[PDB]
């Protein structure tokens, strides 16, 4: 399967503190451009954590988005 083919798969994120709110978005549900997908980090065969994580690049917050929330540990 390809990252674009299986772009309807989302992942649940949990906030580090009570103030923050959990996140749940998918590839197709967070991208609206072919080239856009390229930058964010979408070649072809994605792993699992990589696909969802691409969202940070879309929203422009890969710095504190992966730290403030439980993404990569």
Among candidate residues 63, 69, 61, the one with its CA nearest the CA of residue 15: 69
Q: Can you say how many angstroms the Cα of residue 25 is from the centroid of all Cα atoms in its chain?
A: 7
What CA–CA distance (Å, rounded) separates 59 from 65? 9
Domain count, the chain: 1
Way the structure was solved: NMR
Say if residues 16 and 23 touch (Cβ distance below 8 Å): no
Q: What are phi and psi of 35, to 5 degrees?
A: -60, -35
- Residue 69 belongs to domain with CATH number: 1.10.8.440
For 23, the domain range is 1-73
């Amino acid at each position: 399967s390809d990252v674009w083919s299986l772009s309807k798969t989302s992942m649940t994120f949990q906030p580090k503190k009570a103030s923050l709110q959990p996140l749940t978005i998918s590839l197709d549900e967070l991208f609206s451009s072919r080239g856009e997908f390229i930058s964010v980090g979408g070649d072809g065969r994605m792993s699992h954590k990589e696909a969802i994580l691409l969202g940070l690049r879309y929203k422009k917050l890969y710095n504190q988005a992966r730290v403030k929330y439980s993404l990569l540990e």
